[PDB]
Design a protein around this ligand. Structure first.
Ligand SMILES: *[C@@H]1O[C@H](CO)[C@@H](O)[C@H](O)[C@H]1NC(C)=O
Lengths: 380, 49, 125
């Protein structure tokens, strides 16, 4: 029995469902992963600390979970201190912090390559501060270096109850500067809100171009802006054309909705897929640890997480490396990690929205950058 | 029809739509309210009474 | 976290101290939870967090008013990511209304006008 801690945010049903499905798929007779699940407010540092200390006191060998920008420092610090490996689908940490396994690939490079692909020199960058500002720094450095005109506006601070008034105002500002090209790097709901307002005022017509900067493009609702005439480009880390993803979806679309909330659909959010893939990665990690005849079994209790002075357990490093040397094939494509826990050798599909629905025009490789995939009237 | 008009962007200034039914306020008017197009209708139920 | 828990275990009535951008959330959360007042010279919290007494006044308004005073339209904004981006986001939100062209460089076009926004040591460098 290998005890691990799960940390799930309140409301992530599909992610936890994909967690359970991943637990069922990758279960084996060799060893058995035993999850301890904590459902909490992920933006709360106190709750995250308490949960972490609880899982640690229980003596877990690894911790899967999510974090916000308000709780990320606590995770990285505690995991880097107590040497407890953390697995996450959430945004990549800004830095080289140890004992953190990020399932989410970097989106900045693909975004920049997409900006260069459409040859934009002047555009608007709408962004949410909830994930990180690293991408903002990236587009600002590239704005300076490539001599661009970028209007970066923060929509994170505005309250949702009075939001439509400030939306109308900001769009009045964007119509003032003649801005026809906008990038949404936001939360999917925030993206939905901005899109809804774009549709309301009518800036979703021809001449406008929107780049949704998220891992899944098809994860949100694209039908309302599909027939508008505006070019809508996005990213997709989950390719539904793969046989693996095809089969996984064939089972996922038939799963019981009563037992698994939000698991009866033909598509799946990239976070849930990264959760599934995370379960796979952990399984392979412990499997490799057992294959290398390396004993990680705890001799005694882990004790209090705040014990002074704090002494990290020795096999934690062994577990960390064991998680970072794993190279497998999941829903997110090729899963391989560098020593810092970052995703390497991955592929992010570049998608375009047409009348017949979303279509892939190319892809962005980790080393190869952006590569493209290769009724007319009479003339008198 | 309203959703499609909004989708293609014909709900802006210069357009005028007349809803011919007894209730004007019975449906959702919020989506075409900020478009800029003039929208006229009929109301048989006076909520001021 | 350990220091805060130690001081709390000692039974202090108030806590004076400093925090970084990586440790600010811990302070605000724990102090907001245990109703223990925190006093700090460090940067003001981004929000309405309770039980936090910030001695340092806000610099956003004075900075914006100063930029508007010199009648600046196009300029470069140098910033430290080790310190923070809050004032930067402020001038970026204000850039559209006041018609500004800002070139943001992280220190962590013939530009003749520069904003530094750093630590006194980094500023000296
Ligand atoms: C990525 O890893 C795969 C195997 O998973 C390998 O065949 C391929 O050469 C690697 N490509 C790059 C660009 O590193």
């Amino acid at each position: 029995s290998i005890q691990i801690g799960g940390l799930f945010p309140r409301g992530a049903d599909q992610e936890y469902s994909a967690f359970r499905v991943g637990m069922v798929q990758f279960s084996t007779s060799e060893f058995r992963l035993t999850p301890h699940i904590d459902n909490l407010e992920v933006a709360n540092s106190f709750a995250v600390t308490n949960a972490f200390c609880s899982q640690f006191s229980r003596g877990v060998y690894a911790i899967f979970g999510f974090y916000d920008k308000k709780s990320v420092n606590t995770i990285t610090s505690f995991c880097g201190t107590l040497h407890v490996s953390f697995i996450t689908p959430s945004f990549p940490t800004d830095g080289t912090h140890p004992f953190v396994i990020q399932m989410r690939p970097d989106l900045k490079g693909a975004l920049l390559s997409l900006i260069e692909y459409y040859q934009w020199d002047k555009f608007a960058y709408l962004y949410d501060s909830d994930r990180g500002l690293s991408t903002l720094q990236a587009v600002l450095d590239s704005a300076a270096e490539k001599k661009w005109q970028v209007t970066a506006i923060n929509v994170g601070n505005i309250n949702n109850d009075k939001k439509d008034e400030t939306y109308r105002s900001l769009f009045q500002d964007l119509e003032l500067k003649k801005e026809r090209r906008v990038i949404l790097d936001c939360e999917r709901d925030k993206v939905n809100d901005i899109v809804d307002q774009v549709i309301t005022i009518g800036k979703h017509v021809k001449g406008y171009h929107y780049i949704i900067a998220n891992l899944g493009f098809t994860d949100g609702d694209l039908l309302k802006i599909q027939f508008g005439g505006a070019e809508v480009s996005g990213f997709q880390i989950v390719d539904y054309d793969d046989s693996l993803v095809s089969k996984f979806i064939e089972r996922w679309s038939t799963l019981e909705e009563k037992e698994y909330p939000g698991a009866h659909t033909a598509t799946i959010k990239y976070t849930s897929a990264l959760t599934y893939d995370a379960v796979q990665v952990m399984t392979e990690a412990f499997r490799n640890l057992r294959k290398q005849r390396i004993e990680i079994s705890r001799r005694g209790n882990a004790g209090d997480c705040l014990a002074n002075p704090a002494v990290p357990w020795g096999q934690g490093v062994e577990i960390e490396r064991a998680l970072k040397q794993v190279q497998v094939e999941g829903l997110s494509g090729n899963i391989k990690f560098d020593q810092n826990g970052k995703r390497i050798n991955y592929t992010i599909n570049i998608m375009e929205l047409k009348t017949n629905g979303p279509r892939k025009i190319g892809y962005w490789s980790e080393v190869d950058k952006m590569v493209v995939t290769l009724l007319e009237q009479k003339t008198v």
